Design a protein around this ligand. Structure first.
Ligand code: CL
Ligand code: CL
Ligand code: CL
Lengths: 9, 276, 100
């Protein structure tokens, strides 16, 4: 299942 | 043997025409099992392989909200890169993201991936030690410091080393042999006379999974490449793959040519010799 | 920016036996950007109802897709695949060779 922790580039 | 779970994210910005489009696609080895499409009405995560359908309603709701979050994350990521590179509203740019974990027959991780690409070119990617980044230009170096700014690859290595391999394991034991067992190619050779002088032999491999195959033509048991015409491995449509290799041979010397098939689903490599 | 030319390929799912039912395929790949116009055509005319896979990409970030349709091969009908992309002067068509 897809990862859930996000960041901006 | 070796197995891999990979997610493929594509975000493409549309100026004036709505807001960017997001697509997700999920692969166990090279079987697609989930997808997400932001351009849809009621955009859900949808099953694309029968062994994932057994997941509970909470699996699907949870992932739908992940992709919805992920889409918005890439919108502002698109803007940040626009600024790094000083580009314009005149411009449809693209963010490509790929992550996943490769496991051996162990259950142990061999290589984790977390790489991005701006506008086709590689932007940033995570080094195999899962602690480092490798930036392609001066723009990605601001991202590289942004991404040692909140101590990020820690949460990214923890997913790759941790739950990514377990999710692969869960999907492997649920998909049973239809996904763990390699299906071998059905191979035969066809003969087309092209003229008085010549003819083609075509080595066909069909029905194989996974897609990694090697097809070689030999003459008198030694190698021969400068007449080979290979085609790129193509999806059959039913989760199997196809390929062929061809040689042009002097009419009457066909029997001197052997085709050689390597595929993991074969117990020993094949050799095929067309017989008149 | 990197721009890449597609790779067209028309074929069938199973081996082409006339009258018996099968699926026509047009697998396009190796291109950039994502936008692509791909029609499968029967006798010069577009086949409507054409499905396709979910846009995906290879390790060099090249995009790839598989447009396909249920069909039936005859001894005179001529099938093909027309493809447009911003790297292309005009649509490119590739005729279905049942042996390739
Ligand atoms: Cl579409
Ligand atoms: Cl199915
Ligand atoms: Cl079928």
């Amino acid at each position: 299942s897809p990862r859930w922790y996000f960041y901006y580039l | 043997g070796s197995h891999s779970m990979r997610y493929f994210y594509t975000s493409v910005s549309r100026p004036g025409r709505g807001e960017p489009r997001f697509i997700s696609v999920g692969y166990v080895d090279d079987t697609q099992f989930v997808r997400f499409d932001s351009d849809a009405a009621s955009p859900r995560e949808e099953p694309r392989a029968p062994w994932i359908e057994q997941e509970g309603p909470e699996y699907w709701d949870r992932n739908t909200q992940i992709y919805k979050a992920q889409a918005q994350t890439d919108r502002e990521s698109l803007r940040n890169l626009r600024g790094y590179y000083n580009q314009s509203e005149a411009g449809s740019h693209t963010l490509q993201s790929m992550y996943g974990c490769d496991v051996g027959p162990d259950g142990r991780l061999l290589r984790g991936h977390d790489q991005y690409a701006y506008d086709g070119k590689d932007y940033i990617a995570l080094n195999e030690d899962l602690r480092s980044w490798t930036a392609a230009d001066t723009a990605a170096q601001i991202t590289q410091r942004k991404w040692e700014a909140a101590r990020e690859a820690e949460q990214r290595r923890a997913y790759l080393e941790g739950e990514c391999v377990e999710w692969l394991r869960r999907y492997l034991e649920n998909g049973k042999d239809k996904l763990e067992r390699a299906d071998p190619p059905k191979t035969h050779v066809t003969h087309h006379p092209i003229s008085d002088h010549e003819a083609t032999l075509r080595c066909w491999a069909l029905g194989f999974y996974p897609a990694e195959i090697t097809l070689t033509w030999q003459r008198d048991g030694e190698d021969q490449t400068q007449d080979t015409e290979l085609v790129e491995t193509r999806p059959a449509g039913d989760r199997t793959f196809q390929k062929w290799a061809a040689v042009v041979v002097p009419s009457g010397e066909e029997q001197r040519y052997t085709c050689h098939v390597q595929h993991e689903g074969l117990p020993k490599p094949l050799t095929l010799r067309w017989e008149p | 920016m990197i721009q890449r030319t597609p790779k067209i390929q028309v074929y069938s799912r199973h081996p082409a036996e006339n009258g018996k039912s099968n699926f026509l395929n047009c697998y396009v790949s190796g291109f950039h950007p994502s936008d692509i116009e791909v029609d499968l055509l029967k006798n010069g005319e577009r086949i409507e109802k054409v499905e396709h896979s979910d846009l995906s990409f290879s390790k060099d970030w090249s995009f790839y897709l598989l447009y396909y349709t249920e069909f039936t091969p005859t001894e005179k009908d001529e099938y093909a695949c027309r493809v447009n992309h911003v790297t292309l002067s005009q649509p490119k068509i590739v005729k279905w060779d049942r042996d390739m």
